[PDB]
Amino acid sequence: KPYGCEECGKSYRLISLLNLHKKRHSGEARYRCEDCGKLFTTSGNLKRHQLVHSG
């Protein structure tokens, strides 16, 4: 199933593929939003984004 970037709209074959695509945009992919699966290199950037799901 085409796994595409919600952000830029490129579909990948694998999740890890798109995961590395998502990693590519931020350099590296550390944390993810435990809800929507957005990768943040900063847990605080993440946190603020986590708080929009529970804020």
Query: Which residues of the shown chain bind Zn ion in the complex (CB under 5 A)?
Result: 5, 7-8, 25, 33, 35-36, 38
The closest of 55, 33, 54 to 44, measured between CA atoms, is: 33
Cβ atoms within 10 Å of 50's Cβ, excluding its own: 19
Whichever of 1 and 40 has its CB closer to Zn ion, that residue is 40
Whichever of 1 and 17 has its CB closer to Zn ion, that residue is 17
Residues 6+ apart with CB under 8 A from 44: none
- In whole angstroms, how close is the CB of 16 to Zn ion at the nearest point? 14
Whichever of 1 and 8 has its CB closer to Zn ion, that residue is 8
